[PDB]
Design a protein around this ligand. Sequence first.
Ligand SMILES: Nc1ncnc2c1ncn2[C@@H]1O[C@H](COP(=O)(O)O)[C@@H](O)[C@H]1O
Length: 636
Amino acid sequence: DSPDERLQRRIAQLFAEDEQVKAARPLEAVSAAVSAPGMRLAQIAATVMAGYADRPAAGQRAFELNTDDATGRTSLRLLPRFETITYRELWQRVGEVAAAWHHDPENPLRAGDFVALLGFTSIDYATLDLADIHLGAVTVPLQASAAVSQLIAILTETSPRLLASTPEHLDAAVECLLAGTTPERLVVFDYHPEDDDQRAAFESARRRLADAGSLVIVETLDAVRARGRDLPAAPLFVPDTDDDPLALLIYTSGSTGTPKGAMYTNRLAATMWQGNSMLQGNSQRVGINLNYMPMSHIAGRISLFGVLARGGTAYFAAKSDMSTLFEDIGLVRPTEIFFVPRVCDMVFQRYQSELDRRSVAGADLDTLDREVKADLRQNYLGGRFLVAVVGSAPLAAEMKTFMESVLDLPLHDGYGSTEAGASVLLDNQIQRPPVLDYKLVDVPELGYFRTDRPHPRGELLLKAETTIPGYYKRPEVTAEIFDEDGFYKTGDIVAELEHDRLVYVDRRNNVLKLSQGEFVTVAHLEAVFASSPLIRQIFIYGSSERSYLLAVIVPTDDALRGRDTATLKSALAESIQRIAKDANLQPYEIPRDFLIETEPFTIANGLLSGIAKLLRPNLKERYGAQLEQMYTDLAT
Ligand SMILES: Nc1ncnc2c1ncn2[C@@H]1O[C@H](COP(=O)(O)O)[C@@H](O)[C@H]1O
């Protein structure tokens, strides 16, 4: 069997033996209806919900409430299984919310009003999101990672009439409202009043707003639906054929703090359903997936909407910090996955741990490795993967090879952006559609030229059907992302192998010139060193005044075990050297010294984004002083 033949053989067994997978094949009549010319965003949703009515649409983990008789506290506790809701039931919930908002006797919502949502991803989140779509309200999915000051700025700029929040974000939400922002109602969702912690947050919100003399109505999503259940059906918002109104703002920061609201019109939002991408809906692939990325990111919206578009089932991860990710994947057994490199890291770290534990005397090492990967593939990852994509950040060549040997299928490298669209580059190939044209521009100061070495290099400029028109209420910032000829400037350096074949290098702003005149690509190198078995996380740092790099390294638990600081450092240094040799790195690409950090980078401490990407500005603010001091200590 060839590698594709192995894959096709696994897939046929699945369609022969697995009733869940068979029952979830997309219906071509539904897909054709969705694809029809003239279909607007809400018409797509309604058509999908009607076409797949009796199928399971969405799942989340079952739960129980537990009272501790010592503390007297009642706490929600997750069970190791998922429960689903049908398309019919989801759309019914959506219709209840839309009715409640449209037919409110005093202050109803109208098309074009902004609605702000503070959460992760969940059935309730999907319900609010689709209800916005139903009424043509503009969704503003706020990043849970944002600081309150940033949230206030966003709300000030968008003037939402409604703010919805999960209990754990009620602290931030109340501060936003006490600051005199525009929302008229605060809707609490993902809410279980039987949990004492959640109930206390909800009561506190209610109390604090009342005490401040706020006229905000605080209410539960369940109560909104109860209202809507006794109101007439709401109209479905369908813009006229010549109009493409705003439907969604996706806030995105880049390097520098400064969140900007990427404008997603009705047509752009619809591509999340019916689009080109591997994981968007223009496909007959069975979509059973685990949604673990927030709805505040485009990859999280695609992972939901692209699956709904194909009549599949979207399961929502229980926690936003990936701490339940593999328990969830093992239960869901998805047919498809969008990896981010941090998840690949976790799979690699599981592999290393299991391989070490099982490499006992008398183990056959020429066999064990295969068995450890088979166990990962079949059990840890569910054993039903038909396809796998990695995106959002670079994955090192060796880690890609590793992941393919575990998955035993291709790991497609998908390059895209909030500004440009998800498709753009797939396995180094320009995707047409949506790309219309592209151009490489020289960046003399970074040493990238059309006349370069084996391949032309430079900044990628593109035109695509999926590019945003600009950022909301930011005329200046908008004008700088487009050149005189209308090309979107990606900020990304690429190498052009042939026409329509491009290799991603790094962000322009990550390209660092060392003092001796060599260029290093800092995020690319971070990815390379992910392949160290001793490294849990790594941040690479350099200064153009220096001839070498430094790093902040979070070691694995096993790396730490039974080692003092000095021996840990030498072990890390030895590993870095091996990894470097394997990846054929130049000596100037190798960190010469580093800080050991035993506290991992997380969303909670501001060092990771909501999709587990290193936040470089926050890492520089956190460690920059210590790192420049290390430079100084080494110089003296
Ligand atoms: N497959 C990929 N490989 C490397 N970098 C990527 C990939 N996909 C996205 N990125 C990076 O992520 C940026 C988009 O970030 P955002 O719009 O915040 O999701 C791009 O401009 C790239 O720098």
